[PDB]
C-alpha cells in the first residue's frame, strides 16, 4: 500500500540501518537468506511497505546505503542479514570527506548525489503511492551530515508533497569525538530547518545513560545503541504494517504534532526498557508503561523537558490494550503536572494504539514529544560555533573549498532566530 | 603456409645461428619453418663453424653456402667483383626452396649494412629477388651503424651505398643499432659487459614474436601481408623503430608485476627502442603491437587509449586510429643459457615515425666529410665503381630527408 524507502548515510547511518533491517525482518518472519517462513497471514499482507518480492519467495529490503568509505559497506555484507540487500543499491564513493562538511556538501557531493538520486528515483517509482522517505544520519560527521543534507534538499525539490523523516544523532560537549562538531552541527541544522518535514533529535549521551541505569549493561557496544534506536524507528511505522483500534500514519502525527512549520525537532523515548534482573519483577499495564514512558531520564535525547514546557506530545502503543486506559492515562499525566504543558492548546497529547506487539514482549510503547526545552541544544552548540568563528579557527578548509564568510553569518542568524522563536512560542 | 629466411654475412648468420636455435627449441605448426634457410658469406670461417658445431646434422650440407675469399668491408668488392660469382648459385637454390613451398608468405633477409658482404651482395641478392618474384614480401631486418659506437672506418660509405637499394627493394625495413641494444642490455638486463651473443638472442625474440601469428592460433592473428598495409603510409617510407617488453632479468621478473598496461607504456619510452633515436623529436605515423601469451582484448584496448590521451608523445594529424593490434596465445619460450626470464606475456612494438629522419641526417655529415676530401674512394673506384654513384647516392638521401620533413608536416 503506502511505501517508505530507506536511505542510510555515512558510517553511523549504515550501522544503524543494518540492525534496523535485522529487527524488521524478524518481525515479518524473513530468514537471513531472504525467504518467507512465517505462519500468520498478518505478516504476509503488509510487507509491500518495506520489501519487494523478487522471484520465488525472495523479499529484498527497500533500502539504499550511501557513504564515502568502503569499510562500512563491507562491514554490512559481512554480518548476517547482509546478503539480503540488492547490490545495486550500494551507491558508493571512494575518496572520503574527512569530517569536512564542505567536502561532503560541495566537493565530493557533486559527484555522488546524482548517482544516489538515480537509485532513490528508481525506488520511488518502483512503488505506487509513497508515504514518505526515511533518512538515518548524524550531525557531527562529514559524509553523514553534508552528504545526507544535500540529498535531503534535492529530494524535497523533486517530491515536495511527500513526508520525510530524518533520524539524526547530534553532538554534545561531553561526548565529543570530532573537533569541528559545532561547524558541522550549526550548518547542518541550518539546512534541516528549511528542508526536512520533521526531524527526530537524537544524541549519544542519552544512549549511554539508558544503557547505564535502565538497561544496566556492562559492555554496551554500538550494537546495543543501534538496537535501541531500531526499536524506536519500528514503533513509528507499526501503524502502517498492522491494523489496530486507533491507527496513526506518519502524516497524521506530523499534522497533529507540529503547531508551527519551522518547529519540527522532536524528543523520543521508548517503553518498556528493563534490565534482566527486573524483567521478571515487573507488571505490564498501561499506567506502568506511561510513567516509565514520560520519565525524564528515559528520554532518548539529553535535553530534559522538565526545564521547559511541552508544546505537543504523542504516544504510539502496541499490543492488546483497552483504549479507555490509553485516554485516561494521558489525561491524568497532564492534570497533575499541569505547569509542564503549554496552556493555549488543550489536550496537548495525541495517542494511538496498534494491536501487534514487538516479538518477545507482551506490550510496548513509543513516545514522541515536541517540547520547548530543545533550545538548550541549539544554544549549547551555537556559543561553541561563535567561539570558534570569531578567530577563524579551522576555517581554511571551509573557505578554501567554497564557503564564504556570509554563510557562517547566515548560519548564526538562522540559529539565533530559531532559538528566539522557540522562546516566543513557549 | 611457410616463410623462408636468408642470412648474409658475419652478422647475418650469427643472428641466424641464434634465431634457428630458438625455432628448434620452440617446436603442424612447425610447417612454416621445418630448415627453410640459407646461410651465405664470402669468408668461410663463420659458416664452417656451423658445419662442425652442434647443429651439424640439422642443416642439409648444401644449404650452408660459402665463398672463397672475403669482400673485406668493401661494398664495391662485395657487389661487383666477388658477388658476381656466388650470388647466382645462391638464388638458383632459393628458387627450388620456393618450389618446395606452396603458400609462400615471403622471404626475410638478415644483413648488416656496415660490411661488404652484408651490404654489397645483400643489395645484389635483393635486386634479383625483386625481378624474379616482385609480389612476394621480403622483410629486411638490417643492422645500421651507431652514431658514436663504431667498429669500422669506411662504414658511412657502405651504409649510404647500401641504403640506395634498400629503399626500393625491401618492403618492410626494421632498423637496429648496436649502441641502443648495448644500452638495453646495460639498463634493463643490467649486463655491464655484453658481447654479440646476447644481442643476437634478443634480436631472435623480436623475429619470433612477429611470426608467431602464422605459427600458432591467437585471438587476433596477423600475417606478413598485414604489416604491409597497416604501417607504411607511402611506398618509400618503410623504416621501423623496434621495441620489446619486458626485457627483464631472471630475478627482477618475479619481483615486478608484469601486466598489459605498463608494458604497453614501457614499449613506448625511448629508453627501450632498438634504434638510437629519440622519437620525442618525431611524430608517430603508425604503431603496431604484437601481444604474445596471456592477453585478453580488453586491456590491450584500454592501453592504447591511455597512450592516445597522453601528451608526452604525439601522433601525426592524419591518423586518429593510429594503431594495429595483434594477439597470440602461446607465451614466449626461453633458451637455457639465455638471460630473459619466462613471462606470461610480452609485447613487440613496431612503429613508424619521423625520428628516423634524424639518423639519416646524422649519417650525412660523416659521409659528407670523408667524401669531400676523397678519402678511401680509390679502393672502391678501382674495384669497379666511379664518382657518379657516390654523388648520386648522396642526393638520394638528401631527397629522403626532404621527404620525411614534408610528410611530417
Amino acid at each position: 500500500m503506502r511505501e517508505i524507502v530507506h536511505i542510510q548515510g555515512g558510517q553511523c547511518g549504515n550501522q544503524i540501518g543494518a540492525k534496523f533491517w535485522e529487527v524488521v525482518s524478524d518481525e515479518h518472519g524473513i530468514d537471513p537468506t531472504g525467504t518467507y517462513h512465517g505462519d500468520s497471514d498478518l505478516q504476509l499482507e503488509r510487507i509491500n511497505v518495506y520489501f519487494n518480492e523478487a522471484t520465488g519467495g525472495r523479499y529484498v529490503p527497500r533500502a539504499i546505503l550511501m557513504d564515502l568509505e568502503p569499510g562500512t559497506m563491507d562491514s554490512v555484507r559481512s554480518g548476517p542479514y547482509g546478503q539480503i540487500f540488492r547490490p545495486d543499491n550500494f551507491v558508493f564513493g571512494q575518496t572520503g570527506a574527512g569530517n569536512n562538511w564542505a567536502k561532503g556538501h560541495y566537493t565530493e557531493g557533486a559527484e555522488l548525489i546524482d548517482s544516489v538520486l538515480d537509485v532513490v528515483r528508481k525506488e520511488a517509482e518502483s512503488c505506487d503511492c509513497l508515504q514518505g522517505f526515511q533518512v538515518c544520519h548524524s550531525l557531527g560527521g562529514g559524509t553523514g551530515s553534508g552528504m545526507g543534507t544535500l540529498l535531503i534538499s534535492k529530494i524535497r525539490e523533486e517530491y515536495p508533497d511527500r513526508m520525510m523523516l530524518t533520524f539524526s544523532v547530534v553532538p554534545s560537549p561531553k561526548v565529543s569525538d570530532t573537533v569541528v562538531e559545532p561547524y558541522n552541527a550549526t550548518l547542518s541544522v541550518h539546512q534541516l530547518v528549511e528542508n526536512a518535514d520533521e526531524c527526530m533529535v537524537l544524541d549519544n549521551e542519552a544512549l549511554y545513560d539508558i544503557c547505564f541505569r535502565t538497561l544496566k549493561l556492562t559492555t554496551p557496544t554500538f550494537g546495543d545503541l543501534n538496537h535501541l534506536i531500531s526499536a524506536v524507528m519500528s514503533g513509528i511505522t507499526c501503524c502502517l504494517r498492522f491494523p489496530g483500534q486507533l491507527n496513526a500514519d506518519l502524516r497524521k502525527l506530523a499534522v497533529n504534532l507540529i503547531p508551527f512549520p519551522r518547529l519540527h525537532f522532536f524528543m523520543v523515548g521508548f517503553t518498556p526498557l528493563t534490565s534482566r534482573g527486573s524483567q521478571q519483577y515487573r507488571a505490564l499495564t498501561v499506567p506502568e508503561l506511561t510513567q516509565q514512558m514520560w520519565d525524564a531520564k528515559n528520554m532518548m535525547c539529553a535535553a530534559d523537558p522538565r526545564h521547559g514546557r511541552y508544546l505537543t506530545a504523542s504516544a504510539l502503543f502496541r499490543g492488546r490494550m483497552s483504549t479507555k486506559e490509553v485516554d485516561e492515562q494521558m489525561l491524568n499525566v497532564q492534570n497533575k503536572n499541569s505547569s509542564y504543558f503549554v496552556e493555549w492548546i488543550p489536550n496537548n497529547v495525541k495517542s494511538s494504539v496498534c494491536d501487534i506487539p514487538p516479538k518477545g514482549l507482551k506490550m510496548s510503547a513509543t513516545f514522541i514529544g515536541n517540547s520547548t526545552a530543545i533550545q538548550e541544544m541549539f544554544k549549547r552548540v551555537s556559543e561553541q560555533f561563535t567561539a570558534m568563528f570569531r578567530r577563524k579557527a579551522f576555517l581554511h578548509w571551509y573557505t578554501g573549498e567554497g564557503m564564504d564568510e556570509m554563510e557562517f553569518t547566515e548560519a548564526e542568524s538562522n540559529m539565533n532566530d530559531l532559538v528566539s522563536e522557540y522562546q516566543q512560542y513557549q | 603456409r611457410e616463410v623462408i629466411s636468408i642470412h648474409i654475412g658475419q652478422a647475418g648468420i650469427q643472428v641466424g645461428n641464434a634465431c634457428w636455435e630458438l625455432y628448434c627449441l620452440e617446436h603442424d605448426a612447425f610447417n612454416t619453418f621445418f630448415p627453410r634457410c640459407i646461410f651465405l658469406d664470402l669468408e668461410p670461417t663463420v659458416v664452417d663453424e656451423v658445419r662442425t658445431g652442434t647443429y651439424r646434422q640439422l642443416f642439409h650440407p648444401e644449404q650452408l653456402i660459402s665463398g672463397k675469399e672475403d669482400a673485406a668491408n668493401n661494398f664495391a668488392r662485395g657487389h661487383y667483383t666477388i658477388g658476381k660469382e656466388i650470388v647466382d648459385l645462391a638464388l638458383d637454390r632459393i628458387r627450388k626452396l620456393a618450389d618446395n613451398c606452396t603458400g609462400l608468405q615471403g622471404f626475410l633477409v638478415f644483413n648488416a649494412v656496415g660490411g661488404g658482404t652484408g651490404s654489397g651482395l645483400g643489395s645484389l641478392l635483393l635486386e634479383r629477388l625483386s625481378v624474379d618474384y616482385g609480389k612476394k614480401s621480403k622483410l629486411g631486418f638490417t643492422v645500421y651503424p651507431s652514431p658514436q659506437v663504431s667498429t669500422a672506418v669506411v662504414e658511412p660509405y657502405n651504409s649510404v651505398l647500401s641504403t640506395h637499394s634498400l629503399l626500393e627493394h625491401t618492403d618492410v625495413a626494421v632498423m637496429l643499432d648496436n649502441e641502443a641494444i648495448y644500452d638495453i642490455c646495460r639498463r634493463s638486463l643490467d649486463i655491464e659487459r655484453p658481447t654479440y651473443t646476447n644481442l643476437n638472442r634478443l634480436i631472435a625474440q623480436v623475429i619470433s614474436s612477429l611470426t608467431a601469428s602464422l605459427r600458432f592460433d591467437g585471438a587476433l592473428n596477423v600475417d606478413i601481408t598485414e604489416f604491409q598495409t597497416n604501417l607504411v603510409p607511402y611506398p618509400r617510407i618503410h623504416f621501423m623503430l623496434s621495441s620489446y617488453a619486458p626485457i627483464i632479468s631472471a630475478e627482477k621478473a618475479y619481483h615486478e608485476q608484469l601486466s598489459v598496461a605498463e608494458i604497453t607504456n614501457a614499449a613506448f619510452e625511448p629508453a627501450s627502442m632498438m634504434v638510437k633515436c629519440d622519437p620525442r623529436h618525431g611524430k608517430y605515423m603508425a604503431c603496431c603491437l604484437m601481444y604474445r601469451g596471456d592477453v585478453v582484448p580488453k586491456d590491450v584496448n584500454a592501453s592504447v587509449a591511455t597512450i592516445k590521451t597522453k601528451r608526452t608523445i604525439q601522433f601525426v594529424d592524419w591518423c586518429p586510429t593510429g594503431f594495429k593490434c595483434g594477439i597470440n596465445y602461446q607465451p614466449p619460450t626461453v633458451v637455457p643459457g639465455g638471460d630473459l626470464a619466462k613471462v606470461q606475456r610480452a609485447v613487440c612494438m613496431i612503429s613508424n615515425s619521423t625520428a628516423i629522419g634524424e639518423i639519416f641526417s646524422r649519417l650525412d655529415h660523416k659521409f659528407d666529410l670523408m667524401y669531400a676530401k676523397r678519402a678511401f674512394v680509390h679502393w672502391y673506384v678501382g674495384e669497379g665503381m666511379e664518382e657518379g654513384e657516390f654523388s648520386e647516392a648522396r642526393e638520394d638521401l638528401a631527397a629522403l630527408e626532404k621527404d620525411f620533413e614534408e610528410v611530417g608536416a
Partner: protein, 50 residues
C-alpha cells in the same frame, strides 16, 4: 649534451601544460542554455495546469 637534455625536458614540459578545450567549453555553455530554456518552459506549463 647536457644542454640538449635540458632543452628536450623544457619542450616536454611546455607540451604538457593544460590548454583550454574550445570544442568542449562551448558544448558546456550550450548545454546550460538549453537547461535554462527548459526551466522557463516548465513554469509556463505548470501555470497552465493550475
Amino acid at each position: 649534451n647536457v644542454l640538449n637534455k635540458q632543452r628536450d625536458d623544457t619542450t616536454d614540459a611546455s607540451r604538457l601544460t593544460p590548454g583550454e578545450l574550445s570544442e568542449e567549453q562551448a558544448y558546456i555553455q550550450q548545454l546550460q542554455d538549453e537547461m535554462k530554456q527548459i526551466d522557463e518552459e516548465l513554469v509556463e506549463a505548470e501555470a497552465k495546469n493550475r
